[PDB]
Amino acid sequence: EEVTEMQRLVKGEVVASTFDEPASRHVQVAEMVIEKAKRLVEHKKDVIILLDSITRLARAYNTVVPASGKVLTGGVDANALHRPKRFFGAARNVEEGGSLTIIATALIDTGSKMDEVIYEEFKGTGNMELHLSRKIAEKRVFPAIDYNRSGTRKEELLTTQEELQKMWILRKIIHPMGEIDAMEFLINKLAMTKTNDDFFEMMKRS
Amino acid sequence: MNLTELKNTPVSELITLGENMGLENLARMRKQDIIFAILKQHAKSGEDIFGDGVLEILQDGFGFLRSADSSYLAGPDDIYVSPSQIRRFNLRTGDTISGKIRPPKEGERYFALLKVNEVNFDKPENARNKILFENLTPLHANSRLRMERGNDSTEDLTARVLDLASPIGRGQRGLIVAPPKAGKTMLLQNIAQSIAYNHPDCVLMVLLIDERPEEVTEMQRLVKGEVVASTFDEPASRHVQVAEMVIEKAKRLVEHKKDVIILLDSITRLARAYNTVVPASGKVLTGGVDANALHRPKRFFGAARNVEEGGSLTIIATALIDTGSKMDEVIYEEFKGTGNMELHLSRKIAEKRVFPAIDYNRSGTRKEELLTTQEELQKMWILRKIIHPMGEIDAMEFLINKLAMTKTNDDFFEMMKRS
Amino acid sequence: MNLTELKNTPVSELITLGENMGLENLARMRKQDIIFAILKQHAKSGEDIFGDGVLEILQDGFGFLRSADSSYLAGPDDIYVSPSQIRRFNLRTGDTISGKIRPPKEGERYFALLKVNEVNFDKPENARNKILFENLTPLHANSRLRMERGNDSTEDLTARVLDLASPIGRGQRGLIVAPPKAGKTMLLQNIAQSIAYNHPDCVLMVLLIDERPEEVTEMQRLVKGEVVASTFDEPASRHVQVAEMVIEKAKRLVEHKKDVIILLDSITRLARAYNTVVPASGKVLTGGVDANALHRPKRFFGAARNVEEGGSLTIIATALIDTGSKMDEVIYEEFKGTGNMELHLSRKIAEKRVFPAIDYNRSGTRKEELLTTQEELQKMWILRKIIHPMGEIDAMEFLINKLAMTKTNDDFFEMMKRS
């Protein structure tokens, strides 16, 4: 039922594998998406991939790969996680033309250990990050995004000179505040403003 | 239907109104909860509900519409205002907001303001163009306030003595030095009666800090005006919250070309709460009072100004001395030269059962030429010349008998001219 | 058959009653367990059992019917009430509930209330329409309480001196400043005797904190009223539990147009338990007392009000000074200006074997015009004029001899008129 809702809502190409399907099916479809994206990138086209989830993807990859005779912590082999690294690392910006954008989701605090071992190796492998907090969601405040923990690298190229400075000013105010108090502080400010530009000029008053 | 008239109704009538409406078990609960319950039930009928009060802004950004009837105490019946409405209409702490209030939806415990049609007893558009109080240029007092009452002709001579000892004008920043058990409470009550009688147009506000509950009730019955007070059992933060509420409300009224008179009691009590609330800066001065702790009372006391453009703010405060607390002596010392008018009371005079126990020699005022007239000023100087050689105690009974057999101060003045 | 009469019976008779009933080994066990055992055996006969007490509500939601005989101590004989009965009849902590109690079934260790037929000595339906104490408007004291006893004519002049030094009325919020070993305990006992004699209608309640067990027993035998106390060996939480029980019970009685007089001993001891029970807020003030720690005693002490509609609550407390403990000095300072009547005792006077050791000059009262009459008030002023030049010690023996040779205070008053 989650796959059907995604197809109706997303205006694009949606492919998914259900839980009842074997782990080999998950591997087969995962390689199909990335290989299709790479061919489109070669034709000077931009492809954006929404991945969900790396932990689930690494779960199928670990089972499919045969055992090498050595078992590491959490029952995950070193070569087992090699395949997700290839899939995740393919997100590149081609100088000649086109780009491949990959956005993935990581599961933490799920009560398992595999889902942690997997998260730890996939920490420093991301250009941008986005950490969610369960406690914020418990307060019925959305989106439950940890502003202090979230960040990006080389944001100078993306934003403009004027826009970049405004973001730095906002981060300075948010940092002393806690991860939970920052959201409701930001939500009310954005609620009464039309666009982000109106919010930015309001902070300049203070 | 209207919030302001519902709170003024007696509690006994409040229960009866809710019983016929359909509510139950309203007798054994606080009056504030009853008002919220009645409005909640009446909101189901779909009829519009009118509400008003004094608006304050919290640190988060949203505000509440406090009611002066409950001494600006937080309650379930307080009206909540979204920060968006603040941008539409420039509002700050102290101003009065009146308008329709919508029923609170699920998830919120406070009423929300729907449409505002009256700001500071004026059109909201006109209130947006008012100039801020801090930009106004203060001046010396020039409007004489006749504290003497002729029609009453009561046996108390406090009103007659007060005019002779130290005339009080509009925009004065005077303070009263009153030892304990020296008739300080009745001194303020007599002044309030004259203000409500001689100058009904002037707005009179009475603020009391750390006063007994029975003392607050008597003040409300006697003073014909707006009286707000905080009891001793309430926390020190409550005293700070109400103190800023009164001055902020007064400043907004002054901007509308209105005259506000504030009776403060007491600066020592007010400074006591301010010192505790402010966090320690790591340095403790003499008496346990920080330098920044007394900064807040200075702002409150110094706001008494006479606006050149129009209106004035008169603040009359009381100072406690010889209460056997260094904490209170240090506070008094910094508040000595900060007054345009001074009024020092003597315990020894009160011990002789002579009232009012006012030290005529110690009492005085600055720039009395503007308040009194040319003829009246000279008569006061002649009286002071006779009083000065006499002691602080012998001067009162000398003055009391002279005023006792005279009808008005004019009759007393012409009698002294004989000698 | 009736719970209240069974506890008042002597322990020796209690054992004999249970032996003939059929129970055994009741001699070597606590009296509270014996009452539960006797009721349990009597419940098997099927006869109805009547019970009564003071109702309190726990934080979970259910409550128990504590008994004032055991100083509101938790025991197996306490009556349990379901939260459902609370919705049917609006009950809060303090009120008295009387009715039939059913035998406890298997799985429960407490009796359950079956049907309530008496609430606050009134019909339960009528008690539901009572107005809450907090909505009542307090006023100043106006009902004079004659503390002097004429029929007794005892050699002690404490009652005669107390009226002259500081008259006590209904709804007063006075406090007593008593140094250690200054006859503080006997001072309260003498007041209790006059109240139980001159005003039998008024309800007298005595609360003692951190008192010795032998001191509690003497107080019960001497005071003709309801006496509840907590011993020092009991935990500080027990002191807090009993303190709130007394004031909540008094408030409910005041709502029924009744007058309640509370003798508190002591505020310093009461504040000692309150400070320990409240959790630390992370900030410690001078003397190890938090600002919020003393908030609870302020609520308890400030509840003394004179209801305009009817009834009054009089609270008389004792303050300990010069005890060698700083913490205790800080408590006294915040409780200086909170009282209508003050009564300061002097250790030096007690060292001279002169009683009562009362500082006449330091003692006083506010709004004494309402309590005394026009003729009586003037006589007191004349006496104070003579006493004031004299020292705090010489004034007592001067007053003692004059009162010793006079029958009543009226005879003493006319004697001073000769001079």
Ligand SMILES: Nc1ncnc2c1ncn2[C@@H]1O[C@H](COP(=O)(O)OP(=O)(O)O)[C@@H](O)[C@H]1O
């Ligand atoms: N103008 C006055 N005329 C007569 N008596 C007065 C006057 N002012 C005060 N008193 C006396 O003072 C007493 C109350 O003093 P109080 O107001 O408690 O002093 P303080 O405010 O300094 O504590 C009353 O008993 C009253 O008789």
Ligand SMILES: Nc1ncnc2c1ncn2[C@@H]1O[C@H](COP(=O)(O)OP(=O)(O)O)[C@@H](O)[C@H]1O
């Ligand atoms: N009214 C009085 N008349 C005579 N003696 C008194 C009186 N009040 C107290 N005392 C003396 O005080 C002593 C007890 O003092 P106590 O009550 O322990 O003081 P405190 O309560 O301050 O500790 C007794 O020995 C008694 O002789």
Ligand SMILES: [Mg+2]
């Ligand atoms: Mg006073």
Ligand SMILES: [Mg+2]
């Ligand atoms: Mg004692």
